[PDB]
């Protein structure tokens, strides 16, 4: 299974809320290409390949491992959606 799934289910009331979180966060991770991540070098999920071991290209897994630390924040109507994208695409290319 996905490691920490019990904990993740425990992190929110509805599992669907978790799904939405992971989805949106993975989306954000795809937008800036992992440069917006909250994970440190040892925390970076890595996929092993015969060519070489690099950071796992899958964004969903990255979102999972991300929220697993709880360094992120989530909730309904947390901040205006307006400035949400203005200072997001700003900080990272």
């Amino acid at each position: 299974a996905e490691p920490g799934i019990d904990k993740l289910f425990g992190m929110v009331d509805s599992k669907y809320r978790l799904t939405v979180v992971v989805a949106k966060r993975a989306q954000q991770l795809l937008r800036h290409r992992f440069k917006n991540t909250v994970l440190e070098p040892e925390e970076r999920p890595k996929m092993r390949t015969l060519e070489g071991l690099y950071d796992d290209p899958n964004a969903v897994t990255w979102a999972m491992k991300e929220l697993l630390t709880g360094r992120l924040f989530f909730g309904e109507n947390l901040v205006p959606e307006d400035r949400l994208q203005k200072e997001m695409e700003r900080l990272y290319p």
Binding site: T49, L50, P57
Partner: protein, 56 residues
């Protein structure tokens, strides 16, 4: 054209595969369990391997 399928593409495929899962369905679909998410594993043969437990 020309299915060479060089090892490069066999590995590249896995480079875009790993971490993502595909839904497996068995008709008739009655229980919702008739569709379950499964991690794709590149394997020989044209047959699809399914775990014996969920076969029930």
């Amino acid at each position: 054209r020309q299915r060479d399928i060089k090892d490069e593409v066999w590995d590249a495929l896995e480079e875009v595969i790993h971490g993502k899962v595909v839904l497996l369905n068995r008709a008739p679909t009655l229980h919702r369990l008739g569709i379950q998410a499964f991690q794709p594993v590149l394997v020989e043969g044209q047959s699809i391997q399914l775990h014996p437990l969920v076969c029930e």
